[PDB]
């Protein structure tokens, strides 16, 4: 695989772990777009800025040279040389990331970073196959019910399914990229993620 593979889906749909596994199996990097949005949210929080000031947030993001490091075991984000990754998959970031992800300048910043990487790679996100790499040769979209998404997210947070589901449902209401028209759509509530990885790899290697 010498081009680009995109794997998009809603939160906790499995696109991150599937992308990491598919990429490892192909011997190419994977790019987690969400980790960049999480980093922008975490930095805006810690910086004490009003995230509605896009100009100031973008000066902060550009000034700290925030960069995505693709490592086979999992991506890392460094800001002024500091690895922020351990602070990004937390309840506070989950709860505020939507406020910065909707800012056009922040999406442009994330997309610029991603579009810098030389192919091949597997990129995962919400809109990798639609907004960022519409030319990708292999596109996949993973669907998942709110219930299985809340169950998976709860496994990785202090909160339980009951609360996570309420949170995800309110977030869903609050906003969206649909699958790309040429993406293979797979529901991760029917197939196990191990089966999804195998199925995605069989399509890529054909
Ligand atoms: N391509 C992407 C990836 C993530 N996001 C935003 O980043 C937030 C975090 O990403 P994750 O569900 O992939 O970890 C998402 O909830 C969403 O707000 C996005 O808006 N577009």
Residue numbers in the entry: 1 to 175, 178 to 208
Paper text:
NMP kinases include adenylate kinase (AMPK), cytidylate kinase (CMPK), guanylate kinase, and thymidylate kinase, which catalyze conversions of respective NMPs to the corresponding nucleoside diphosphates. NMP kinases are bi-substrate enzymes that bind both substrates simultaneously to catalyze phosphoryl transfers. In this research, we determined structures of the ligand-free-, CMP-bound, CDP-bound, and ADP-CDP-bound forms of CMPK from an extremely thermophilic eubacterium, Thermus thermophilus HB8 (ttCMPK). The overall structure of ttCMPK consists of three domains: CORE domain, NMP-binding domain, and LID domain.
We also solved another structure of a CMP-bound form, which was crystallized under a different condition. In contrast to the CMP "open" complex, this complex showed a closed conformation. We designate this complex as the CMP "closed" complex. Comparison of the overall structure of the CMP "closed" complex with the ligand-free form revealed large shifts in the position of the NMP-binding domain and LID domain relative to the CORE domain. The RMSD value between these two structures (196 Cα atoms) was 6.56 Å. These shifts lead to closure of the substrate-binding cleft, where CMP is bound. Therefore, it can be indicated that the closure of the cleft occurs by rotation of the NMP-binding domain around the α6 helix as an axis. It should be mentioned here that crystallization condition for the CMP "closed" complex contained AMP-PCP, an ATP analogue. No electron density of AMP-PCP was found, and no significant movement of the side chains was observed in the ATP-binding site. Furthermore, three residues from the CORE domain interact with CMP in the CMP "closed" complex. Lys15 and Arg126 interact with the α-phosphate group, and Asp127 interacts with the amino group of N4 from cytosine.
